Amino acid sequence: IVGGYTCGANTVPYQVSLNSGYHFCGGSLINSQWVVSAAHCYKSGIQVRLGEDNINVVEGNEQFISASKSIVHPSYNSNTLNNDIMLIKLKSAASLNSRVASISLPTSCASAGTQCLISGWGNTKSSGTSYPDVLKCLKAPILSDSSCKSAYPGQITSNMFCAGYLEGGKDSCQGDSGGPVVCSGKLQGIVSWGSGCAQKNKPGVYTKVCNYVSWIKQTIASN
């Protein structure tokens, strides 16, 4: 997170860290056994880490559970990052408590202007590489589709939305991928891509989760 702030220990209880000997992506706990992340985060040998703040220290409240299966959306295109969504099933259910809780799916899409909370352990620098120990947070508004499309001509599909600041300086970045975009207590998006990080007139593009609620529900119900 570039331009964000320290969240505070376990203030984002649905935030998940995908680990494989190191943190490589984020995710969101949607129920005790299912995590929603980004398709481009797909990798084998995934350990899901819940209740994390400092990802390098064992402070307590953590729960390390292996992923039993990762279901990348069938129509995901690795070049356009369209349908950039993936479901991870936990080998065991998580122990839902105060510091580890699930987030709700949207029953409707969020409109431009809605303020959302984006979080993750990704790069904090625009020009360079700096990774945080603790979870960073960033509040950013969902931009308008015209603006989103004016920034990324011919690259935005109906399953994507822009969020962030056109002036730059505040944005998600590498390592945040898969992470949540919560608007009004509903998981509205997934950190997907963007041209660089926190650049002028180049806001972050996120996967529009509201277009996938049915798919998620049906997929989870069949596995």
Ligand SMILES: N=C(N)c1cccc(C[C@H](NS(=O)(=O)c2ccc3ccccc3c2)C(=O)N2CCNCC2)c1
């Ligand atoms: N600015 C953001 N909000 C943001 C969020 C996540 C990741 C990145 C870094 C990167 N930005 S980039 O300019 O290097 C970039 C942009 C679009 C891409 C599309 C396909 C493949 C790689 C791409 C890399 C990126 O978009 N990806 C990381 C690698 N995999 C796909 C997503 C930026």
Ligand SMILES: [Ca+2]
């Ligand atoms: Ca920890």
